[PDB]
RNA sequence: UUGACCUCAAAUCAGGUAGGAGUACCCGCUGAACUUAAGCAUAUCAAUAAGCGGAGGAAAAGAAACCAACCGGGAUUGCCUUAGUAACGGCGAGUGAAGCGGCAAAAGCUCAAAUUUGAAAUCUGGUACCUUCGGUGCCCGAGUUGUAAUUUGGAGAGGG
RNA sequence: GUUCUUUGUAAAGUGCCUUCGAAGAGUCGAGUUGUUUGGGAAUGCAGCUCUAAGUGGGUGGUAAAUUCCAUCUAAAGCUAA
RNA sequence: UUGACAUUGUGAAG
């Protein structure tokens, strides 16, 4: 991660004596805690499953995991959120 | 505390328990007047994070507003202009339905100040909102340091000028290159960019 | 309208309340641990660790929920009349998870009158005097058999679906002929 | 309206521009007002220097990174290294910027030195209220100017290894261009 | 029978508050056409005039879900500049910002989300008195479906 | 500048060790329609439909899959020149 | 005017 010392190339830039700043607590905003993990687990067993989540579970058992992502992408937004949702449904299926 | 559980449970809007509650409550709201006083918040957890406190001087109102687009109110659809302005049906109001509900409650109680509002329910015809209002004349508010800023005359009819949370979003009051048109006010920015500046010793 | 529709099990569990005989004994024990009134507060303050350790009923939704999560509540009373039902709808599951016995009792106004409030919506006992240990254990066994031990089966049962008086007669008539 | 050999003009005057003409007739008047405001603020506020001490920072961008200028405020780490707290620093006339970070040791050392010199050249009056009269210096920036750091000595010896600088630039440029394609070939094999 | 609670009403009930005017400047909504393109419909005029709602001595914005790609900068506003530039456009007529750099002015902050639980510690009103932009005692009421103290990410909290 | 009250077994700041560290939902985001912008596989705003996550989320000015990196901390609020 | 989605739940058969 050191600079080469010249104005062009991969690690272009001037060499200076590096320092490590203290980590900022705001960088851990999305970090799970013991309190919030307990609440979310308790709510899931109370509320149950959404109608589109039930259809996703059926597709995993009957039509494979690949088609579940295609449907999950349509109900959700981006493709990255569909992958996370499918993995969440797999854990629910596994713990049964 | 129970507020943490309420926050997470409110996010499961399509669960069986919340579907039952939303069907019963939407019927009850439809039977009441379009604007009516609410005895207590329906979502106490949501009210607290928007600034509500359970003390004298805080008032909750419930309001019902019609959904859909804004039909251009011209007779028989005639616009009398160029074809680019002949649209009538597919036009959209530039302010949200939440703002419309907030403004109408403000006129009903002109002695109060609107703090915030939140969504509660909706059907095909209507959306339902609850509005938080503060009494600027009550001594429990005027003697409280955290809330007596609302008593300043500069904060009269905040919802009419779009100074509330929903008003600032519709105005595009945000930072970054995405909001270059409306960072400091769209019309103020336009005036600055369309002004001819001349000095005594011409440049 | 709330009884014509099918009630989900999470809400339907609140239709079962403590019976009159055991509820009367429940309030008899709780009435021995009333919080001190403002008048009793004044005499205590002017006398003042010159005071003995107090024993009183714990109340307050945020206060009681924290007590359950820390394994400190020995018995929790739940009102069935909370109009924003979400405030208390999760308590039976939370108590079941933490192993704290609970009872759905009839009347938020009645819970309030034992804590000098108009309404309370929740009450709990954390520490009881030695002379009342036997009474508390007898109540817990009776209360557990009605709510805690039946939680698994109640969670699977839907409520509601009751027809009106005239609709019931019409259906019964068609079934007979 | 096009004739003769003339440049193409782009004068933007097709709106109601005459309604939005701003002539600065009050340029001299505003200078008098600003000087009056500075004079009345200096007398009103304190024998304080009318401005806060600022740190020295590196200007961003490859076009301006060769110069140092005044930043907004000293970092939390910089004020801690000087032996004071952020809350107390603000009341003594030191600007504190909590969102700036330290990654350069040279900049960090320079800002620490500035804080040391500032504390040695000021007198903090006690809160009792004695407040002996002192001469008011109107500019802390003038008292503590910012200087460009030295880079090299005036003359040295010629140390040539025979390698061409032009060749070095070409090879470094070529290495970056083909880095991705070469890695793919190695991965495939 | 009696007494609570919840919700909903009434009173020339006790005390308050809103309307209208002004509107140069300020915050929003709504919204043209003449005109230009040598015709004309997209475009342009213009996110303008007219219409409607709402403030102040300023308003608004404001302490980053920012800019950057640098050895990084560091709330907002304004001036000089960037620049008639990147870009948009029957790519026609025309339109058109932003980062950096210099300067003016500089100022920072707090709620929600935690059990005071060996003590609702909080507050409106009434009444008596007083050193009256308020204070004290007392009495009802609000409030546990949460009023104070404590902590707002730069952190911070429980123990030693 | 002088003077009357001790506020207070009050309040605040600073070192080291250990366990923790709660952070805003019909919202973000996505599709579509209209309007708007210099913003161009779509700059902002709004209607309808769908509707999240917690080592997460937004942004990095050409759509997409995959692998990294940088940078901030939205959906709550006040504030002179 | 026609279709789709939302409003939109409950039970049975072909
Ligand atoms: Cl808030
Ligand atoms: Mg940060
Ligand atoms: Mg009266
Ligand atoms: Mg404006
Ligand atoms: Mg023409
Ligand atoms: Mg002509
Ligand atoms: Mg013509
Ligand atoms: Mg006008
Ligand atoms: Mg005035
Ligand atoms: Mg001014
Ligand atoms: Mg202001
Ligand atoms: Mg911040
Ligand atoms: Mg800035
Ligand atoms: Mg234009
Ligand atoms: Mg428009
Ligand atoms: Mg890119
Ligand atoms: Mg594109
Ligand atoms: Mg503001």
mmCIF file with all atom_site columns, N, CA and C in Angstrom, chain D residues 154-180:
data_model
loop_
_atom_site.group_PDB
_atom_site.id
_atom_site.type_symbol
_atom_site.label_atom_id
_atom_site.label_alt_id
_atom_site.label_comp_id
_atom_site.label_asym_id
_atom_site.label_entity_id
_atom_site.label_seq_id
_atom_site.pdbx_PDB_ins_code
_atom_site.Cartn_x
_atom_site.Cartn_y
_atom_site.Cartn_z
_atom_site.occupancy
_atom_site.B_iso_or_equiv
_atom_site.pdbx_formal_charge
_atom_site.auth_seq_id
_atom_site.auth_comp_id
_atom_site.auth_asym_id
_atom_site.auth_atom_id
_atom_site.pdbx_PDB_model_num
ATOM 1  N N  . UNK D 1 154 ? 19.775 23.693 -1.703  1.00 0.00 ? 154 UNK D N  1
ATOM 2  C CA . UNK D 1 154 ? 19.996 24.489 -2.907  1.00 0.00 ? 154 UNK D CA 1
ATOM 3  C C  . UNK D 1 154 ? 20.833 23.741 -3.940  1.00 0.00 ? 154 UNK D C  1
ATOM 4  N N  . UNK D 1 155 ? 21.861 23.016 -3.501  1.00 0.00 ? 155 UNK D N  1
ATOM 5  C CA . UNK D 1 155 ? 22.747 22.331 -4.431  1.00 0.00 ? 155 UNK D CA 1
ATOM 6  C C  . UNK D 1 155 ? 23.156 20.981 -3.856  1.00 0.00 ? 155 UNK D C  1
ATOM 7  N N  . UNK D 1 156 ? 23.396 20.023 -4.751  1.00 0.00 ? 156 UNK D N  1
ATOM 8  C CA . UNK D 1 156 ? 23.786 18.671 -4.377  1.00 0.00 ? 156 UNK D CA 1
ATOM 9  C C  . UNK D 1 156 ? 24.762 18.128 -5.411  1.00 0.00 ? 156 UNK D C  1
ATOM 10 N N  . UNK D 1 157 ? 25.059 16.837 -5.297  1.00 0.00 ? 157 UNK D N  1
ATOM 11 C CA . UNK D 1 157 ? 25.901 16.137 -6.253  1.00 0.00 ? 157 UNK D CA 1
ATOM 12 C C  . UNK D 1 157 ? 25.045 15.332 -7.222  1.00 0.00 ? 157 UNK D C  1
ATOM 13 N N  . UNK D 1 158 ? 25.559 15.158 -8.435  1.00 0.00 ? 158 UNK D N  1
ATOM 14 C CA . UNK D 1 158 ? 24.834 14.435 -9.476  1.00 0.00 ? 158 UNK D CA 1
ATOM 15 C C  . UNK D 1 158 ? 25.016 12.939 -9.256  1.00 0.00 ? 158 UNK D C  1
ATOM 16 N N  . UNK D 1 159 ? 23.923 12.253 -8.931  1.00 0.00 ? 159 UNK D N  1
ATOM 17 C CA . UNK D 1 159 ? 23.915 10.808 -8.711  1.00 0.00 ? 159 UNK D CA 1
ATOM 18 C C  . UNK D 1 159 ? 23.097 10.174 -9.831  1.00 0.00 ? 159 UNK D C  1
ATOM 19 N N  . UNK D 1 160 ? 23.778 9.694  -10.867 1.00 0.00 ? 160 UNK D N  1
ATOM 20 C CA . UNK D 1 160 ? 23.135 9.096  -12.030 1.00 0.00 ? 160 UNK D CA 1
ATOM 21 C C  . UNK D 1 160 ? 23.488 7.616  -12.086 1.00 0.00 ? 160 UNK D C  1
ATOM 22 N N  . UNK D 1 161 ? 22.466 6.765  -12.139 1.00 0.00 ? 161 UNK D N  1
ATOM 23 C CA . UNK D 1 161 ? 22.652 5.322  -12.210 1.00 0.00 ? 161 UNK D CA 1
ATOM 24 C C  . UNK D 1 161 ? 22.584 4.780  -13.632 1.00 0.00 ? 161 UNK D C  1
ATOM 25 N N  . UNK D 1 162 ? 22.401 5.643  -14.630 1.00 0.00 ? 162 UNK D N  1
ATOM 26 C CA . UNK D 1 162 ? 22.318 5.225  -16.009 1.00 0.00 ? 162 UNK D CA 1
ATOM 27 C C  . UNK D 1 162 ? 20.922 4.905  -16.501 1.00 0.00 ? 162 UNK D C  1
ATOM 28 N N  . UNK D 1 163 ? 19.939 4.834  -15.607 1.00 0.00 ? 163 UNK D N  1
ATOM 29 C CA . UNK D 1 163 ? 18.566 4.564  -16.006 1.00 0.00 ? 163 UNK D CA 1
ATOM 30 C C  . UNK D 1 163 ? 17.890 5.842  -16.488 1.00 0.00 ? 163 UNK D C  1
ATOM 31 N N  . UNK D 1 164 ? 17.128 5.725  -17.571 1.00 0.00 ? 164 UNK D N  1
ATOM 32 C CA . UNK D 1 164 ? 16.421 6.858  -18.151 1.00 0.00 ? 164 UNK D CA 1
ATOM 33 C C  . UNK D 1 164 ? 15.107 7.091  -17.414 1.00 0.00 ? 164 UNK D C  1
ATOM 34 N N  . UNK D 1 165 ? 14.862 8.345  -17.028 1.00 0.00 ? 165 UNK D N  1
ATOM 35 C CA . UNK D 1 165 ? 13.589 8.692  -16.406 1.00 0.00 ? 165 UNK D CA 1
ATOM 36 C C  . UNK D 1 165 ? 12.431 8.515  -17.380 1.00 0.00 ? 165 UNK D C  1
ATOM 37 N N  . UNK D 1 166 ? 12.641 8.867  -18.651 1.00 0.00 ? 166 UNK D N  1
ATOM 38 C CA . UNK D 1 166 ? 11.607 8.664  -19.661 1.00 0.00 ? 166 UNK D CA 1
ATOM 39 C C  . UNK D 1 166 ? 11.273 7.186  -19.814 1.00 0.00 ? 166 UNK D C  1
ATOM 40 N N  . UNK D 1 167 ? 12.291 6.324  -19.792 1.00 0.00 ? 167 UNK D N  1
ATOM 41 C CA . UNK D 1 167 ? 12.053 4.886  -19.845 1.00 0.00 ? 167 UNK D CA 1
ATOM 42 C C  . UNK D 1 167 ? 11.274 4.413  -18.625 1.00 0.00 ? 167 UNK D C  1
ATOM 43 N N  . UNK D 1 168 ? 11.581 4.971  -17.452 1.00 0.00 ? 168 UNK D N  1
ATOM 44 C CA . UNK D 1 168 ? 10.877 4.585  -16.233 1.00 0.00 ? 168 UNK D CA 1
ATOM 45 C C  . UNK D 1 168 ? 9.392  4.917  -16.320 1.00 0.00 ? 168 UNK D C  1
ATOM 46 N N  . UNK D 1 169 ? 9.059  6.098  -16.848 1.00 0.00 ? 169 UNK D N  1
ATOM 47 C CA . UNK D 1 169 ? 7.659  6.487  -16.970 1.00 0.00 ? 169 UNK D CA 1
ATOM 48 C C  . UNK D 1 169 ? 6.909  5.577  -17.935 1.00 0.00 ? 169 UNK D C  1
ATOM 49 N N  . UNK D 1 170 ? 7.536  5.228  -19.061 1.00 0.00 ? 170 UNK D N  1
ATOM 50 C CA . UNK D 1 170 ? 6.877  4.373  -20.045 1.00 0.00 ? 170 UNK D CA 1
ATOM 51 C C  . UNK D 1 170 ? 6.606  2.982  -19.484 1.00 0.00 ? 170 UNK D C  1
ATOM 52 N N  . UNK D 1 171 ? 7.582  2.403  -18.781 1.00 0.00 ? 171 UNK D N  1
ATOM 53 C CA . UNK D 1 171 ? 7.397  1.066  -18.223 1.00 0.00 ? 171 UNK D CA 1
ATOM 54 C C  . UNK D 1 171 ? 6.330  1.059  -17.135 1.00 0.00 ? 171 UNK D C  1
ATOM 55 N N  . UNK D 1 172 ? 6.322  2.079  -16.274 1.00 0.00 ? 172 UNK D N  1
ATOM 56 C CA . UNK D 1 172 ? 5.308  2.153  -15.227 1.00 0.00 ? 172 UNK D CA 1
ATOM 57 C C  . UNK D 1 172 ? 3.914  2.296  -15.821 1.00 0.00 ? 172 UNK D C  1
ATOM 58 N N  . UNK D 1 173 ? 3.780  3.096  -16.879 1.00 0.00 ? 173 UNK D N  1
ATOM 59 C CA . UNK D 1 173 ? 2.492  3.236  -17.551 1.00 0.00 ? 173 UNK D CA 1
ATOM 60 C C  . UNK D 1 173 ? 2.062  1.922  -18.195 1.00 0.00 ? 173 UNK D C  1
ATOM 61 N N  . UNK D 1 174 ? 3.000  1.229  -18.845 1.00 0.00 ? 174 UNK D N  1
ATOM 62 C CA . UNK D 1 174 ? 2.666  -0.019 -19.523 1.00 0.00 ? 174 UNK D CA 1
ATOM 63 C C  . UNK D 1 174 ? 2.309  -1.116 -18.528 1.00 0.00 ? 174 UNK D C  1
ATOM 64 N N  . UNK D 1 175 ? 2.954  -1.116 -17.360 1.00 0.00 ? 175 UNK D N  1
ATOM 65 C CA . UNK D 1 175 ? 2.670  -2.134 -16.355 1.00 0.00 ? 175 UNK D CA 1
ATOM 66 C C  . UNK D 1 175 ? 1.230  -2.047 -15.865 1.00 0.00 ? 175 UNK D C  1
ATOM 67 N N  . UNK D 1 176 ? 0.731  -0.828 -15.646 1.00 0.00 ? 176 UNK D N  1
ATOM 68 C CA . UNK D 1 176 ? -0.637 -0.659 -15.166 1.00 0.00 ? 176 UNK D CA 1
ATOM 69 C C  . UNK D 1 176 ? -1.656 -1.049 -16.228 1.00 0.00 ? 176 UNK D C  1
ATOM 70 N N  . UNK D 1 177 ? -1.366 -0.751 -17.496 1.00 0.00 ? 177 UNK D N  1
ATOM 71 C CA . UNK D 1 177 ? -2.323 -1.030 -18.563 1.00 0.00 ? 177 UNK D CA 1
ATOM 72 C C  . UNK D 1 177 ? -2.566 -2.526 -18.725 1.00 0.00 ? 177 UNK D C  1
ATOM 73 N N  . UNK D 1 178 ? -1.513 -3.338 -18.634 1.00 0.00 ? 178 UNK D N  1
ATOM 74 C CA . UNK D 1 178 ? -1.602 -4.764 -18.907 1.00 0.00 ? 178 UNK D CA 1
ATOM 75 C C  . UNK D 1 178 ? -1.624 -5.615 -17.642 1.00 0.00 ? 178 UNK D C  1
ATOM 76 N N  . UNK D 1 179 ? -1.836 -5.004 -16.476 1.00 0.00 ? 179 UNK D N  1
ATOM 77 C CA . UNK D 1 179 ? -1.845 -5.776 -15.235 1.00 0.00 ? 179 UNK D CA 1
ATOM 78 C C  . UNK D 1 179 ? -3.007 -6.764 -15.209 1.00 0.00 ? 179 UNK D C  1
ATOM 79 N N  . UNK D 1 180 ? -4.196 -6.313 -15.609 1.00 0.00 ? 180 UNK D N  1
ATOM 80 C CA . UNK D 1 180 ? -5.364 -7.178 -15.546 1.00 0.00 ? 180 UNK D CA 1
ATOM 81 C C  . UNK D 1 180 ? -5.296 -8.348 -16.507 1.00 0.00 ? 180 UNK D C  1
#
